[PDB]
Design a protein around this ligand. Structure first.
Ligand SMILES: CCC[C@@H](C)[C@H]1CC[C@H]2[C@@H]3[C@H](O)C[C@@H]4C[C@H](O)CC[C@]4(C)[C@H]3C[C@H](O)[C@]12C
Ligand SMILES: [Mg+2]
Ligand SMILES: [Zn+2]
Ligand SMILES: [Zn+2]
Ligand SMILES: [Zn+2]
Lengths: 69, 49, 334, 389, 92, 45, 49, 243, 102, 50, 49
RNA sequence: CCACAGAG
C-alpha cells in the first residue's frame, strides 16, 4: 500500500527516505544501488525496506468515491 | 566418495550421523549425482513413439 | 587467552574464563580495584544522533545487559491512543493509527510521568503524563495548476499528509514547561498518508511513555549493538604479488603494503568486518589467522531522535544499577 | 506443494480491491516485491500486486519452539508491521416485498432516557444500518430488520446480530435495489489481525510452518551491523526436503539487496551463484552468506556461523482465529438428539469409529461409556419386562 | 429424479445409524485447535488456551474437602479464568 | 443531515423516507452511507 | 532376582484386549509401508507382490 | 495429558510426544476431550497417560522419545571435542532443571591446564542429578553409524568414531548420544532402560530434563546449514565426471 | 511497605542448612540474570550459580546458588548484588569522565 | 439476455485504457474471462475428454 | 491413494478382532466364551513388556 | 438435501 514508517528488522525510520529515493531515481538518473547508500541506508534491512516496496496507494487512489472520476 | 570427501561440522553430515533428520542418500543427492529415477519399478516409460 | 579464534568452519573459545575454579591457582576473583584499574572507555566518534565508543576489559554479560536495557528498557514517548473524526482517506483507521504510533517524538521523557492503568479512562490522563497531538488535513483540487504536468504535488493542495502536520496542543501547565522545547516529530518528512480531493483526516493523539518490551514503538534507539574488535595475526611474512591478493581478501582500508619491503601489514583492524575470505585459499593457510578480542566491545548507538545516544547509554547503566539496588534492598521470603 | 499453497497467499487482490464487497477477502497492509523474481512473474504482472514480505531469516535452531517446521517470529518486527493482515466479510440482506402487499422494514432504534441508545444498538445509527467506521462487538446489531407477521400490519424482529470472537469495524454500507424492486443492503466488516501463535507462514519452496513462539528482539541473535532476524527457521527442514533452491534464493536476495538491484531466479537459468558470491565478497560479507551472529541471551559469539539473509515469505489464510473452537453444552440435532456439526452452528467434535477402537484397545470401559453414552445422547427410557418393548 | 430416503437408507452407509450415530457420535465438552510446540512443558502435560478453558468445564461435586475452593470459584464467576460457569443445587 | 453518497457522481444527499434508493443528480442506484460523525478510538499497535 | 522379576512381570495381564492391540499392530504399519519393487532371491522376473 | 493453562489460543504439547501422534506443526488441528465423570477421568489418566504409554504395543520399542533437533543438540553436547568449565557446565545444569534440582558436580575430566568437564559428564548428571536420585543404569549400545576398531580383537567401545556407548554406574564412559541411545525404535536406549528399571516417573523426569537442556542450549550454541555445506569440492567435480 | 512478592526463596529446593538455595525473581529476564550469574561466579566461595526462565509466556526467573560449607547462599546473593552495583558505578564513572573529556 | 463474458469483444472492457477502466471501477490487471451472474462470478473450467 | 485401502483393511481387522481378551485363567477367549488360543503366543508374554 | 473448494 504505502511505505512503512520503520524498518522491520532494526527499526530505522525509512518513511521519509521514500520521496528522496524517488527523486534521486528520477531527476538525478542514478542507479538505485547508489541512491540507497546516499540516503544513509547502510544496513541491507533498510535497503530492502524501500527497494522492494510497491507504491500501491497511487494505483488505489484512482478509484476515489469522494470525487467524480 | 562424496560422503568420504565431506569434512566435519558439515551440517547435513552431522544431521545424518545423529539420525535426527535426513540420511546419507539425501546428502549424496544434493552434493553428488542424484541417480536414476525409477517409475513403477522400471525406468521412464516411452511416452512417445 | 582472551582471543576468540575464527576458523573456516567453526568459532572456538567463545566463553568467558576469568573466575576462580577455572584453574588450580584460582585467580581472577572479583576485586573492584582491579576492575577499576583495567576497565576503559574510548569514544571514537559522537554525532547528534549516533555514538561509537569502545569498552575495554569488561565482561560479555555486562555489555549484553547494557545492550538489552538500551533496546527494551529505556522509556520513551510514543503515540499511544488515537481518536478519529471524519477519516475518509483510503488508508484505514487502524493502519493510519499504527503509522501515527510509529513516528518518533522529540521530547524528553524525564519531563513526564508514568501512566496508571487502574484508574478510569476519564481520570487516567492528566497533564503530567500525556502529550496531545492534533492532525487536521483537508485535501482539495488546486484550480491553478499547469495543464502539461500530472505531478500529484501540483494537481492538489494537500496530497501528501506528512508527519510535521501533527501539531502540538498544550493542556494546562504544559503551556509553561514546554516553552523552549515544543513537541515535534523527530523526522518531519515521514509520509503519513496520501490524499485526493474530497478527503479529510482529523484526529487527536494522546501520547504517553512506555518501555520497548511492551511495544517496539517505545524503543528509544533505532540501533543499539556491539561488535568485538577484530584482530589479524600474520605469522609468516607475505611477499610480492600474493600479498596484493592478500590485500584483496579484506576490505580496502584494512591491510596495507609496505613499499620498503613489498610485504603486507595490518594497517587497521577496526574497519574489518570479519569475512574470513582469506581462509578460502590454501596459499595463506598456516600463514595468517583471525580472531576477535572477547573483552573489547565497539558499540554503535543510533538514536531515534528523542535522546542523545550517550544519554541512552547512561540511562541503561543507571537502570541496571537501579535493578541491582532494588533486588538488594528487597526482603527474602519463603 | 508451493504450486498448491501459493494460491492461499494473503496480499493485494486488485487495484479496485477497496471498491469491492466480496463474501470473504484477505488483504495485507504492506506487501513487498520478491527479492528474487522470475521471468514468469514479470510476464503475469505478479510484480505489481504481490502477496508476501521479505523477511531477514537466520537459519538456525534458536529455541525448542522451532521443532517440526515451526517458525520463530520477532515481536518487534510484528509490532512494526510485519505480516499485518486484514479480513473483510460481507453481510447481505434483501427486504422482500411479499404477495400480501407487505414489505420488510429496516428502520428501528431504542434509546435510553439519558440520551444513549441501548447497548445492543450502540453502533446502529438512526437509519437502522450500522454506522460506517464504528466498532461492532459480539452481540451488537448492525442491520436491523422487522418482517410482517401476517404472511395496519405489525412487525416481528429479525435482527442481523454480529457474532465473533474479536470485535470488527464496519467499512461500507451499500443500499441499492435490484430489477425486481427489492431493497438490497450489503454491509462490509473489516478486522485487523496481527500474527500470533498458530498463524501459518509459507516459504515459496514448500517449507510451511506455524509461529511456534513470539520472542522480543533483544533475545534474538544479531550481526555486527545490528540487524536482528525477523523469522528463525529450523535447519532440519532442509536435508530431508532437499531444497537447495532456498539457499540459492537467500544468497541471491542478499547479493541483490546489497547491490541494490533485483536478481532473477528464472527456471533453467537465472542469475548464477558465482556472481552472487563475487558481489557479496565485494560488499564485505561471506561468500556463502554465512555470517557471525552474537547470541541475544548469553551475549557471546555463536560457536558456528549462521546462514543469514532475505527470504520472501507469505502469510496464509489459515489463521487460528477461524480454527479455535470449543463446545461444552450447546445445540442438539432434532432427529438424533446428538450435538450438531460445524463450528458455525457451534457443533461438537466427532469421536469416530477408530477413536472408539483405540479406546477399546486401551480397555477403558468406563471412559468409553462416558464418552459415547453419558456426555452425548443419554436417555432414560421405560422398558417392559414381559414383552421387551 | 432424486431417489427418496427409506429406512434401509437410514440404517446403511457411512452416514447411517450404525456407523454414524451408534458406533461413533459427536460428543460434548470438546475443542479443536491448531497445535504448536512447547519444550518447557512436561511430556504428560498439554497447554490449553484460557479462551478454551473458560468454555470447557468440569462438573465437580461439593464435598467436605473442596468446599472452600468451590466457594471461591463460584465467587470468581465465569469471566475470570479460575471460576465456574454453572451451579446445580442438590434438591433442584 | 447529509448521510449518503452516490457511487459515481459523488454528491452527498439525504434520503427522505418517502423517496427511492436513487441519486437525484444522475440515474445511479448505488448509495454508500457516509462515515459517522461519532468519535471512535484506536490503540496504536 | 532381576531375571525372575522381569519374567514374572512380563506375563500378559488378564483382561487385556489383546485382539484389539493385535488388529491395530497389524493394520497401522500398512500406512507407513509404501509400495516398493521386490524380487525373490536373485531372479528378476518373479515379481512377487 | 494433564492440563496447563497458557494464553496463546493454540494447544501446546511437548515435541517428544509428537511421534506417537504423527503430528507436524504445519497447520495440524488436534482434538481435546474432557471426561465428565470421576471414573472416566481416573481411567483416562491411569491407562492412557503419556507416562504409562512410553512404549508402542506393536513391538515394545519406545515411540515417545527425542525427536529431531533434540538428538542434534544432545549429540553436540556429547561430542568428543566439547569441553566446559565450571561456569558453562553450571549454566547447562541450571537450564535443564529450571534451577530446582540440587546437583553435585563430579570431579572434572581435565585438571592440570584448566578444570574442564566433558559433555558426557553433563549427560551423566542429566541421568542422575544427585545421590538422592535412585536412577542407576548400565547399558552397552551401538549407534546409527558405527566404524569398527582398527583391529578385530578390540572391544566395540574402542571404535574410531566412538559410536559405541557404555553406561556403567550412571556415568557415560563412551559414545555419543544419537538416534540409537536417546531416540525411538530401539530397545537399548537410555530412556527405555530407565523406564524398565525404575518406572515411568524417572523416565519422564529425564526426558523433560533433556528436552529443556536441548531447547535452551542450541540458542547459545548456533547450528546452521548453508550452501557451503552442500557445494562440492573442486576435486569431486572431476571424479564424478570420470565415473 | 517492601514488595514481599518481588523475590522469594523456594523452600522445596533449598538445603536445610542453607548452603544451597533457589531464589525466584518476579518481573525480570536474562538482562539481570546473566549479569548476576557472571558476578556471583566470581565469588570464590560459590560452587554453583545458574539462572533460567521456566516459561517465556510468564515473567519469572529462577536462579540457583550453591556454595561450599563456609557461607550460606543468601549472603552470596547479596554480595553478588552489591558487586553488580559497584561494577555499574565504575562503568558509569568512567563513561562520565570520558564524555566530559570530549 | 445473453450473459457476456468479461473482456470479450462484446464487453465494455475491450481495448479500454486504464483511465476508462478506472472510470468503470474495474481493475486493469484482471484476467477477465468469467461470467458475472446473480452477483457472483463464475468460471467455466476447460474440460478434457478422450 | 494408499489411505483408502489401508483404512478399509484396518477397519476390517479391528471389527474382526475386537472381541478377544485374555481371561484370568490365561486363555484367550472370544466374547461368546470360546477359546482361540490356550495361551497367548504359546508362552503368555505381552510384547509390551 | 447435494455439489465444489481447501486443511491434515
Ligand atoms: C532525572 C534524570 C536526569 C538525567 C536524565 C540527567 C542527569 C545527569 C545527566 C548526565 C550528567 O549530566 C552527565 C553527562 C553530561 C553530558 O552533557 C550528557 C550526558 C550525561 C551522561 C548526562 C545525561 C543526562 O542528562 C543525565 C543522566
Ligand atoms: Mg502435517
Ligand atoms: Zn533496518
Ligand atoms: Zn409389555
Ligand atoms: Zn449520483
Amino acid at each position: 500500500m504505502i511505505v512503512p514508517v520503520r524498518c522491520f528488522s532494526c527499526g530505522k525510520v525509512v518513511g521519509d527516505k521514500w520521496e528522496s529515493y524517488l527523486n534521486l531515481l528520477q531527476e538525478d538518473e542514478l542507479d538505485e544501488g547508489t541512491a540507497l547508500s546516499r540516503l544513509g541506508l547502510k544496513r541491507y534491512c533498510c535497503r530492502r525496506m524501500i527497494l522492494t516496496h510497491v507504491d500501491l496507494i497511487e494505483k488505489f487512489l484512482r478509484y476515489n468515491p469522494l470525487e467524480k472520476r | 566418495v562424496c560422503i568420504n570427501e565431506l569434512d566435519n561440522w558439515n551440517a547435513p553430515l552431522i544431521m545424518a550421523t545423529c539420525g535426527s533428520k535426513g540420511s546419507t542418500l539425501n546428502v549424496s543427492q544434493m552434493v553428488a549425482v542424484v541417480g536414476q529415477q525409477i517409475i513403477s519399478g522400471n525406468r521412464v516409460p516411452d511416452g512417445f513413439q | 587467552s582472551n582471543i576468540v579464534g575464527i576458523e573456516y568452519n567453526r568459532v572456538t573459545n567463545t566463553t568467558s574464563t576469568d573466575f576462580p575454579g577455572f584453574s588450580k591457582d584460582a585467580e581472577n576473583e572479583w576485586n573492584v580495584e582491579k576492575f577499576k584499574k583495567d576497565f576503559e572507555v574510548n569514544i571514537s566518534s559522537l554525532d547528534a544522533r549516533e555514538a561509537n565508543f569502545d569498552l575495554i576489559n569488561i565482561d560479555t554479560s555486562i555489555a549484553n545487559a547494557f545492550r538489552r536495557i538500551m533496546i527494551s528498557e529505556v522509556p520513551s514517548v510514543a503515540a499511544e491512543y488515537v481518536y478519529f473524526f471524519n477519516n475518509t482517506s483510503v488508508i484505514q483507521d487502524e493502519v493510519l493509527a499504527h503509522r501515527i504510533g510509529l513516528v518518533p517524538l522529540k521530547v524528553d521523557p524525564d519531563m513526564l510521568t508514568w501512566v496508571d492503568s487502574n484508574l478510569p479512562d476519564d481520570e487516567k490522563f492528566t497533564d503530567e503524563n500525556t502529550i496531545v497531538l492534533s492532525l487536521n488535513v483537508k485535501c482539495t483540487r488546486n484550480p491553478d495548476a499547469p495543464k502539461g504536468s500530472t505531478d500529484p504535488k501540483e494537481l492538489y493542495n494537500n496530497a501528501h499528509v506528512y508527519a510535521r502536520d501533527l501539531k502540538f496542543e498544550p493542556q494546562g501547565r504544559q503551556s509553561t514547561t514546554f516553552a523552549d522545547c515544543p513537541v515535534v516529530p523527530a523526522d518531519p518528512d515521514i509520509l503519513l498518508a496520501k490524499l485526493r480531493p474530497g478527503q479529510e483526516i482529523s484526529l487527536k493523539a494522546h501520547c504517553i511513555l512506555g518501555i520497548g518490551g511492551d511495544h517496539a514503538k517505545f524503543s528509544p534507539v533505532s540501533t543499539a549493538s556491539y561488535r568485538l574488535l577484530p584482530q589479524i595475526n600474520i605469522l609468516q611474512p607475505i611477499k610480492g604479488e600474493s600479498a596484493r591478493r592478500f590485500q584483496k581478501c579484506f576490505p580496502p582500508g584494512v591491510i596495507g603494503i609496505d613499499e620498503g619491503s613489498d610485504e603486507a601489514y595490518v594497517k587497521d583492524a577496526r574497519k574489518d568486518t570479519v569475512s574470513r575470505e582469506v581462509l578460502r585459499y590454501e596459499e595463506f593457510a598456516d600463514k595468517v589467522k583471525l580472531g576477535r578480542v572477547r573483552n573489547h566491545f565497539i558499540f554503535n548507538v543510533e538514536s531515534a531522535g528523542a535522546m542523545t545516544p550517550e544519554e541512552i547509554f547512561f540511562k541503561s547503566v543507571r537502570i541496571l544499577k537501579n535493578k541491582a539496588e532494588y533486588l538488594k534492598n528487597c526482603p527474602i521470603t519463603q | 506443494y508451493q504450486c498448491a499453497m501459493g494460491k492461499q497467499a494473503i496480499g493485494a487482490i486488485a487495484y479496485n480491491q477497496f471498491k469491492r464487497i466480496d463474501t470473504l477477502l484477505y488483504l495485507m497492509t504492506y506487501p513487498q516485491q520478491p527479492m528474487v523474481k522470475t521471468k514468469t512473474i514479470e510476464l503475469i504482472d505478479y510484480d505489481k500486486l504481490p502477496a508476501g514480505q521479505n523477511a531477514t531469516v537466520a537459519v538456525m535452531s534458536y529455541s525448542g519452539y522451532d521443532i517440526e517446521d515451526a517458525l520463530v517470529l520477532n515481536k518487534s518486527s510484528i509490532d512494526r508491521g510485519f505480516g499485518r493482515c486484514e479480513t473483510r466479510r460481507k453481510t447481505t440482506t434483501v427486504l422482500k416485498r411479499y404477495a400480501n402487499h407487505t414489505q420488510d422494514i429496516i428502520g428501528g432504534m431504542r434509546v435510553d432516557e439519558n440520551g444513549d441508545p441501548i447497548w445492543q444498538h450502540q453502533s446502529l445509527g438512526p437509519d437502522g444500518l450500522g454506522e460506517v467506521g464504528m466498532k461492532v462487538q459480539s452481540g451488537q446489531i448492525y442491520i436491523n430488520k422487522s418482517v410482517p407477521t401476517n404472511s395496519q400490519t405489525q412487525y416481528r424482529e429479525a435482527p442481523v446480530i454480529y457474532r465473533g470472537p474479536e470485535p470488527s469495524h464496519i467499512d461500507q454500507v451499500m443500499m441499492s435495489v435490484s430489477d425486481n424492486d427489492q431493497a438490497l443492503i450489503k454491509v462490509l466488516l473489516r478486522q485487523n489481525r496481527r500474527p500470533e501463535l498458530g498463524d501459518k507462514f509459507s516459504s515459496r519452496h514448500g517449507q510451511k510452518g506455524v509461529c511456534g513462539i513470539i520472542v522480543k528482539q533483544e533475545d534474538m541473535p544479531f550481526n555486527d551491523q545490528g540487524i536482528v532476524p525477523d523469522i528463525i527457521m529450523n535447519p532440519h527442514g532442509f536435508p530431508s526436503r532437499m531444497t537447495v533452491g532456498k539457499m540459492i534464493e537467500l544468497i541471491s536476495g542478499k547479493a541483490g539487496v546489497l547491490n541494490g538491484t533485483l536478481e532473477y531466479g528464472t527456471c533453467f537459468g537465472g542469475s548464477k551463484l558465482e556472481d552472487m558470491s563475487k558481489i557479496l565478497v565485494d560488499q564485505g560479507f561471506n561468500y556463502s552468506g554465512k555470517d557471525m551472529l552474537y547470541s541475544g541471551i548469553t551475549g557471546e559469539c555463536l560457536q558456528a556461523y549462521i546462514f543469514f539473509g532475505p527470504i520472501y515469505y507469505q502469510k496464509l489464510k489459515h489463521m487460528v482465529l477461524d480454527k479455535m473452537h470449543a463446545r461444552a453444552r450447546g445445540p442438539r440435532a432434532v432427529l438424533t438428539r446428538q450435538p450438531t456439526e460445524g463450528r458455525s452452528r457451534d457443533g461438537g467434535l466427532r469421536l469416530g469409529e477408530m477413536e472408539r477402537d483405540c479406546v477399546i484397545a486401551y480397555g477403558a470401559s468406563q471412559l468409553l461409556l462416558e464418552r459415547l453414552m453419558i456426555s452425548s445422547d443419554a436417555f432414560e427410557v421405560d422398558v417392559c419386562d414381559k414383552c421387551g418393548l | 429424479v432424486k431417489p427418496i430416503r427409506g429406512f434401509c437408507q437410514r440404517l446403511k452407509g457411512k452416514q447411517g445409524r450404525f456407523r454414524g450415530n451408534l458406533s461413533g457420535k459427536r460428543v460434548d465438552f470438546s475443542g479443536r485447535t491448531v497445535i504448536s510446540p512447547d519444550p518447557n512443558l512436561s511430556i504428560d502435560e498439554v497447554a490449553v488456551p484460557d479462551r478454551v478453558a473458560k468454555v470447557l468445564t468440569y462438573p465437580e461435586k461439593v464435598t467436605r474437602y473442596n468446599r472452600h475452593k468451590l466457594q471461591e470459584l463460584i465467587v470468581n464467576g465465569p469471566n475470570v479464568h479460575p471460576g465456574a460457569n454453572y451451579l446445580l443445587k442438590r434438591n433442584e | 443531515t447529509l448521510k449518503y453518497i452516490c457511487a459515481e457522481c459523488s454528491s452527498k444527499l439525504s434520503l427522505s423516507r418517502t423517496d427511492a434508493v436513487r441519486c437525484k443528480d444522475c440515474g445511479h442506484r448505488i448509495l454508500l452511507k457516509a462515515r459517522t460523525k461519532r468519535l471512535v478510538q484506536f490503540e496504536a499497535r | 532376582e532381576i531375571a525372575l522379576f522381569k519374567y514374572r512381570k512380563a506375563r500378559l495381564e488378564p483382561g487385556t484386549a489383546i485382539g484389539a492391540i493385535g488388529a491395530q499392530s497389524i493394520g497401522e504399519p500398512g500406512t507407513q509401508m509404501t509400495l516398493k519393487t521386490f524380487h525373490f532371491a536373485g531372479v528378476a522376473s518373479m515379481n512377487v507382490t | 495429558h494433564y492440563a496447563k493453562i497458557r494464553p496463546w489460543r493454540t494447544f501446546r504439547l511437548n515435541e517428544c510426544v509428537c511421534t506417537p501422534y504423527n503430528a507436524d506443526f504445519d497447520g495440524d488441528e488436534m482434538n481435546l476431550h474432557v471426561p465428565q465423570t470421576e471414573e472416566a477421568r481416573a481411567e483416562a489418566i491411569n491407562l492412557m497417560g503419556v507416562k504409562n504409554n512410553l512404549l508402542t504395543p506393536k513391538s515394545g520399542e519406545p515411540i515417545i522419545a527425542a525427536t529431531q533437533d533434540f538428538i542434534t543438540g544432545s549429540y553436540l553436547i556429547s561430542h568428543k571435542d566439547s569441553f566446559y568449565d565450571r561456569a558453562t557446565l553450571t549454566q547447562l545444569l541450571s537450564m535443564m532443571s529450571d534451577g530446582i534440582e540440587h546437583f553435585d558436580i563430579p570431579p572434572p575430566a581435565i585438571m592440570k591446564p584448566y578444570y574442564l568437564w566433558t559433555g558426557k559428564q553433563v549427560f551423566s548428571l542429566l541421568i542422575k542429578p544427585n545421590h538422592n536420585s535412585p536412577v542407576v543404569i548400565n547399558l552397552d549400545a551401538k549407534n546409527k553409524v558405527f566404524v569398527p576398531p582398527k583391529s578385530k580383537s578390540l572391544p566395540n567401545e574402542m571404535s574410531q568414531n566412538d559410536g559405541f556407548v557404555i553406561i556403567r554406574g550412571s556415568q557415560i564412559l563412551s559414545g555419543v548420544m544419537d538416534k540409537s541411545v536417546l531416540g525411538d525404535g530401539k530397545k537399548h536406549s537410555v530412556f527405555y532402560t530407565i523406564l524398565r528399571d525404575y518406572g515411568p516417573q524417572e523416565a519422564a523426569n529425564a526426558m523433560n530434563r533433556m528436552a529443556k537442556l536441548c531447547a535452551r542450549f542450541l540458542g547459545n550454541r548456533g547450528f546452521s546449514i548453508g550452501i557451503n555445506d552442500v557445494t562440492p569440492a573442486d576435486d569431486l567435480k572431476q571424479k564424478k565426471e570420470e565415473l | 511497605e517492601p514488595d514481599r512478592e518481588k523475590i522469594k526463596l523456594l523452600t522445596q529446593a533449598t538445603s536445610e542448612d542453607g548452603t544451597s538455595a533457589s531464589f525466584q525473581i518476579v518481573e525480570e529476564d536474562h538482562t539481570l540474570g546473566n549479569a548476576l550469574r557472571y558476578v556471583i561466579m566470581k565469588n570464590p566461595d560459590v560452587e554453583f550459580c545458574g539462572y533460567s526462565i521456566p516459561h517465556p509466556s510468564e515473567n519469572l526467573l529462577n536462579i540457583r546458588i550453591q556454595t561450599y560449607g563456609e557461607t550460606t547462599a543468601v549472603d552470596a546473593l547479596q554480595k553478588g548484588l552489591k558487586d553488580l552495583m559497584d561494577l555499574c558505578d565504575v562503568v558509569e564513572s568512567k563513561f562520565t569522565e570520558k564524555i566530559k573529556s570530549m | 439476455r445473453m450473459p457476456i463474458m468479461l473482456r470479450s469483444n462484446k464487453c465494455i472492457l475491450y481495448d479500454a485504457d486504464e483511465s476508462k477502466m478506472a472510470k468503470l471501477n474495474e481493475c486493469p490487471l484482471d484476467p477477465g474471462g468469467y461470467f458475472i451472474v446473480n452477483g457472483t462470478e463464475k468460471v467455466i473450467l476447460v474440460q478434457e475428454q478422450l | 491413494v494408499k489411505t483408502a485401502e489401508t483404512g478399509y483393511m484396518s477397519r476390517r481387522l479391528m471389527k474382526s478382532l475386537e472381541d478377544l481378551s485374555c481371561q484370568y485363567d490365561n486363555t484367550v477367549r472370544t466374547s461368546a466364551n470360546g477359546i482361540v488360543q490356550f495361551t497367548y503366543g504359546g508362552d503368555g508374554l505381552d510384547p509390551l513388556e
